[PDB]
């Protein structure tokens with residue numbers, strides 16, 4: 815949460831990425847993982863199967 | 868210099884207990900009838 819300054823460099827020579835871990839998200843196969851061991855969690859999903867006529 | 872680790876496997880369906888096919892082996896069968904007997908004043912049907 816701080817603005818940072820470096821002096822004699824160009825924007826091309828810097829790689830910057832946001833970090834936030836206040837919330838989980840789904841284990842999608844189109845987004846990459848964080849850690850190799852891959853600790854995870856679970857969330858029950860609605861609408862179960864049931865019998866009708 | 869960057870490597871991706873791809874991984875996948877197979878699991879049984881979520882509703883496999885609600886719809887599936889059972890493979891069996893069938894042996895000697897047992898007859899079991901339901902007969903009605905009538906004589907005189909009796910009127911009954913028995914499971915035998």
Ligand SMILES: *[C@@H]1O[C@H](CO)[C@@H](O)[C@H](O)[C@H]1NC(C)=O
Pocket residue numbers: 863864865884885
């Ligand atoms: C529907 O009822 C049958 C019992 O005849 C049960 O075995 C089956 O699991 C039921 N299906 C669902 C989706 O609850």
Ligand SMILES: *[C@@H]1O[C@H](CO)[C@@H](O)[C@H](O)[C@H]1NC(C)=O
Pocket residue numbers: 905910
């Ligand atoms: C009693 O026997 C008669 C034939 O005499 C039959 O028509 C009737 O169905 C029998 N009674 C019952 C309750 O089934």
